[PDB]
Design an enzyme around this catalytic site. Structure first.
Site, short mmCIF file in Angstrom:
data_model
loop_
_atom_site.label_atom_id
_atom_site.label_comp_id
_atom_site.label_asym_id
_atom_site.label_seq_id
_atom_site.Cartn_x
_atom_site.Cartn_y
_atom_site.Cartn_z
N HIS A 186 0.78 -0.98 -0.27
CA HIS A 186 0.24 -0.05 0.32
C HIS A 186 0.99 1.12 -0.31
O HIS A 186 0.25 2.21 -0.57
CB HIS A 186 -1.20 -0.20 1.19
CG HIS A 186 -0.59 0.32 2.87
ND1 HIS A 186 -0.54 -0.41 3.41
CD2 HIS A 186 -0.26 1.86 2.96
CE1 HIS A 186 -0.08 0.39 4.39
NE2 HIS A 186 0.35 1.63 3.97
N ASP A 244 -0.44 -7.26 1.61
CA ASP A 244 -0.18 -5.92 1.55
C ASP A 244 1.41 -6.10 1.79
O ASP A 244 1.97 -5.71 3.23
CB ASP A 244 -0.62 -5.12 3.23
CG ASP A 244 -0.56 -3.78 3.05
OD1 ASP A 244 0.60 -3.54 1.73
OD2 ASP A 244 -0.37 -2.44 3.96
N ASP A 250 0.40 0.96 19.76
CA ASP A 250 0.36 0.95 18.31
C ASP A 250 1.21 1.43 17.85
O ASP A 250 2.33 2.03 17.91
CB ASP A 250 -0.90 0.69 18.39
CG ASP A 250 -1.70 0.05 16.91
OD1 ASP A 250 -0.61 -0.70 16.31
OD2 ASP A 250 -2.55 0.57 16.85
N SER A 289 3.80 1.48 7.82
CA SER A 289 3.58 0.57 7.15
C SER A 289 5.15 0.12 6.44
O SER A 289 5.79 0.67 5.69
CB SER A 289 2.89 0.80 5.87
OG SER A 289 1.74 1.26 6.41
N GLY A 290 5.55 -0.90 6.22
CA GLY A 290 6.63 -1.71 5.56
C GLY A 290 7.65 -1.90 6.29
O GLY A 290 8.65 -2.63 6.46
#
Ligand SMILES: *C[C@@](*)(O)[C@H](CCCNC(N)=[NH2+])NC(=O)[C@H](Cc1ccccc1)NC(=O)[C@@H](Cc1ccccc1)NC(C)=O
Ligand SMILES: *[C@@H]1O[C@H](CO)[C@@H](O)[C@H](O[C@H]2OC[C@@H](O)[C@H](O[C@H]3OC[C@@H](O)[C@H](O)[C@H]3O)[C@H]2O)[C@H]1O
Ligand SMILES: *[C@@H]1O[C@@H](C)[C@@H](O)[C@@H](O)[C@@H]1O
Ligand SMILES: C[N+](C)(C)C
Ligand SMILES: C[N+](C)(C)C
Ligand SMILES: C[N+](C)(C)C
Ligand SMILES: C[N+](C)(C)C
Ligand SMILES: C[N+](C)(C)C
Ligand SMILES: C[N+](C)(C)C
Ligand SMILES: C[N+](C)(C)C
Ligand SMILES: C[N+](C)(C)C
Ligand SMILES: C[N+](C)(C)C
Ligand SMILES: C[N+](C)(C)C
Ligand SMILES: [Ca+2]
Ligand SMILES: [Ca+2]
Ligand SMILES: [Ca+2]
Ligand SMILES: [Ca+2]
Ligand SMILES: [Ca+2]
Ligand SMILES: [Ca+2]
Ligand SMILES: [Ca+2]
Ligand SMILES: [Ca+2]
Ligand SMILES: [Ca+2]
Lengths: 210, 143, 249
Positions: free
Chosen positions: C41, C90, C181, C187-188
């Site tokens: 994404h 993803d 969190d 991301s990634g």
């Protein structure tokens, strides 16, 4: 459910006395076998009772590593004879147990009066300080070793010739009580952890009499 | 227990229930009170569930009410000490004892293996780097 | 990362920073000198492919200290089953234009065997997640690399957080009590799991409902499902094109 390959366990129950701790569940193995995992609330999961037809799993050796921790267990189901067929994600069906804190929840076993000894109007009554499943180094710890000051004993005693019951309590394993001479007394004891909210008391010991 | 004329005698816990087996009625004649008799009887009549020698592999049995507990020697566990601690040397059991990778085999003991950049030690389970910067190590801390 | 702490320089040495036109895009995970794993994404909106850069050895984005190594991304490979704007599959495998140099500050994370990952790594309770993403949902990104230990849950125990939305290509980790969190911009980045002295790649920061929301978990790409896919690609004869779709499985 003849189209399913497993069904989840249910009625997961902790059976625990003097720290001997066995998880039990349903159903009896029906085209499936079981594996258990146990962890502390923040610890890693350890597998036990691999691919078993049993509906029980002894977890004593894990819970006695720290009786004051809170443990979580879960029971996984696997297709019989095909135990690696656990779905695309590698996660078999499972159910979670209730939390279990051994120090607070293990049942106290039935006690035993070890001895009594009378001199005139006084009697010693001694309760056996029996072993638990908790190990320290190479040895099993006694109930007193594990619980220290949290453990008490209560004595129920009576004269055969009278209808009343008497009680006494001790912080140790020993009572020193007054008795009338020439009367035969009988005795029973219970182990008690007063600070507990559940499973506070053992059953009564066998009755011993003068 | 009752033999002819014994019951002319006053009851005796020692004579009738300890040296002999006593029935509920014989115990009742000793304690008189129903509740006292019941408290004696629940233990006296329970039986020794260790009599069947349920604890295996050198364990020790402790009788309870309608149950027992087995104390096992250090290499054993189970309700009856039936489980030996190293009897399922399989990859799902603490990784087979392998440091890195584990393979189960049909008809052979499991084997341990190492990732690229590592080699298996003579102990058959441990791995050691064969390159300067193997994967998954933090050199700034292990110096 | 929400509720984490700074990862001291060199203690997350497989972390990658991805930049587009010099601007922060996403994280990634180094798995050898030429290959980086990230999230598909991250690439949904790229048009300036020639300006996609991976930085290794990064820590503080405000200063170059000399341990950073920057590489053009020569190829981004995504699963044939990935659909932009949807959560499943993803993951992306990135080929760098030139190898990085392994140093005390640049080290690959091990790509585990699938069996080991499913049977053993999956049952290590806590794993590290790291990145320069948002410090609070909708808040500011981080200038120093942040890291957080998160506990994993099995999908049955995450189902109620995300009913019908956790596929076999995902797993949940984090704190339903809230306050910790991963978050947007992470991301990634790796969800990295320690076992008996070595660290392994088990997840990729992927998505969640907000960040650190009560009753929810972070959602991670389940790397164990992609081990063979990644290994085959790393052995494959290179194909032309910056963005490549490769068959999955
Ligand atoms: C791209 C990543 O940087 C980022 C990581 C967020 C991790 N969050 C957490 N709580 N641990 N991923 C996204 O922002 C992600 C991208 C996306 C993925 C699939 C489909 C569409 C978008 N989006 C979200 O996480 C986002 C949207 C969302 C909401 C519900 C379900 C899926 C996606 N979340 C938002 C906005 O809260
Ligand atoms: C005599 O030996 C046999 C094995 O050859 C055992 O099965 C017997 O014990 C069984 O029957 C008596 C029950 O009291 C006992 O179960 C109780 O005690 C053990 C606890 O673990 C259990 O929770 C409790 O129900 C049962 O195992 C044995 O007497
Ligand atoms: C009872 O306890 C077990 C553990 C063994 O030590 C036996 O020898 C003993 O009688
Ligand atoms: C039983 N005791 C007298 C040894 C204490
Ligand atoms: C827990 N204890 C110290 C009271 C034994
Ligand atoms: C010995 N004690 C019973 C008086 C405590
Ligand atoms: C031994 N006992 C517990 C049965 C009294
Ligand atoms: C790019 N930088 C100069 C801000 C480090
Ligand atoms: C841009 N640089 C960090 C590679 C020097
Ligand atoms: C970043 N680079 C194009 C200079 C390699
Ligand atoms: C016990 N388990 C690894 C099969 C889940
Ligand atoms: C880092 N940890 C305290 C959450 C385990
Ligand atoms: C208890 N809570 C998770 C609903 C906040
Ligand atoms: Ca007789
Ligand atoms: Ca008689
Ligand atoms: Ca009689
Ligand atoms: Ca006789
Ligand atoms: Ca006698
Ligand atoms: Ca009679
Ligand atoms: Ca009578
Ligand atoms: Ca008994
Ligand atoms: Ca820098």
């Amino acid at each position: 459910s003849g189209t399913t390959n497993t069904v989840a366990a249910y009625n997961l129950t902790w059976k625990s006395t003097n720290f001997k701790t066995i998880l039990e569940w349903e159903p009896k193995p029906v085209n499936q076998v079981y594996t258990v995992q146990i962890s502390t609330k923040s610890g890693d999961w350890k597998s036990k009772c691999f691919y078993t037809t049993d509906t029980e799993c002894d977890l004593t050796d894990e819970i006695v590593k720290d009786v004051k921790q809170t443990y979580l267990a879960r029971v996984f189901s696997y297709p019989a004879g095909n135990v690696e067929s656990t779905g695309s994600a590698g996660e078999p069906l499972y159910e979670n147990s209730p939390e279990f804190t051994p120090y607070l929840e293990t049942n106290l076993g039935q006690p035993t009066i070890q001895s009594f000894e009378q001199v005139g109007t006084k009697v010693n009554v001694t309760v056996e300080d029996e072993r638990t499943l908790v190990r320290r180094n190479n040895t099993f710890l006694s109930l007193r070793d594990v619980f220290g000051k949290d453990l008490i004993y209560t004595l129920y005693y009576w004269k055969s010739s009278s209808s009343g019951k008497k009680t006494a309590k001790t912080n140790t394993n020993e009572f020193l009580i007054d008795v009338d001479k020439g009367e035969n007394y009988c005795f029973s004891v219970q182990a008690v952890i007063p600070s507990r909210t559940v499973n506070r008391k053992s059953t009564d010991s066998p009755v011993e009499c003068m | 227990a009752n033999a002819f004329l014994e019951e002319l005698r006053p009851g005796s816990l020692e004579r009738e229930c300890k040296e002999e087996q006593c029935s509920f009625e014989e115990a009742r004649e000793i304690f008189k009170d129903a509740e006292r008799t019941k408290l004696f009887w629940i233990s006296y009549s329970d039986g020794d569930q260790c009599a069947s020698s349920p604890c295996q592999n050198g364990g020790s049995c402790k009788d309870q009410l309608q149950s027992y507990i087995c104390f096992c020697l250090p290499a054993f566990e189970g309700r009856n000490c039936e489980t030996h601690k190293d009897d399922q040397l399989i990859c799902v059991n603490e990784n087979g004892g392998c440091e890195q990778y584990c393979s189960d085999h049909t008809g052979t003991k499991r084997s341990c293996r190492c990732h690229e950049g590592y080699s298996l030690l003579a102990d058959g389970v441990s791995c050691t780097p064969t390159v300067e910067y193997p994967c998954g190590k933090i050199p700034i801390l292990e110096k | 990362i929400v509720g984490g702490k700074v990862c001291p320089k060199g203690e997350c040495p497989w972390q990658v920073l991805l930049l587009v036109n010099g601007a922060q895009l996403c994280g990634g995970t180094l798995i050898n000198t030429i290959w980086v794993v990230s999230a598909a994404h991250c690439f949904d909106k790229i048009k300036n492919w020639r300006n996609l850069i991976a930085v290794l050895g990064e820590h503080d984005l405000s200063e170059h200290d000399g341990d950073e190594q920057s590489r053009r991304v020569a190829q981004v490979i995504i699963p044939s089953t990935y659909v932009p704007g949807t959560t499943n599959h993803d993951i992306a495998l990135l080929r760098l234009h030139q190898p990085v140099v392994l140093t005390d500050h640049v080290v690959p994370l091990c790509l585990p065997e699938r069996t080991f990952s499913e049977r053993t790594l999956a049952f290590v309770r806590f794993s590290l997640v790291s990145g320069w993403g948002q410090l609070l949902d909708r808040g500011a990104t981080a200038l120093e690399l942040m890291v957080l230990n998160v506990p994993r849950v099995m999908t049955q125990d995450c189902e109620a957080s995300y009913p019908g939305k956790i596929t076999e290509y995902m797993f949940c980790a984090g704190y339903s009590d809230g306050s910790k969190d991963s978050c947007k911009g992470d991301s990634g980045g790796p969800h990295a799991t320690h076992y008996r002295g070595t660290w392994y790649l088990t997840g990729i920061v992927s998505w969640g409902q907000g960040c650190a929301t009560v009753g929810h978990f972070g959602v991670y790409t389940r790397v164990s499902q992609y081990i063979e896919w990644l290994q085959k690609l790393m052995r494959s004869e290179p194909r032309p094109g910056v963005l490549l779709r490769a068959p999955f499985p």
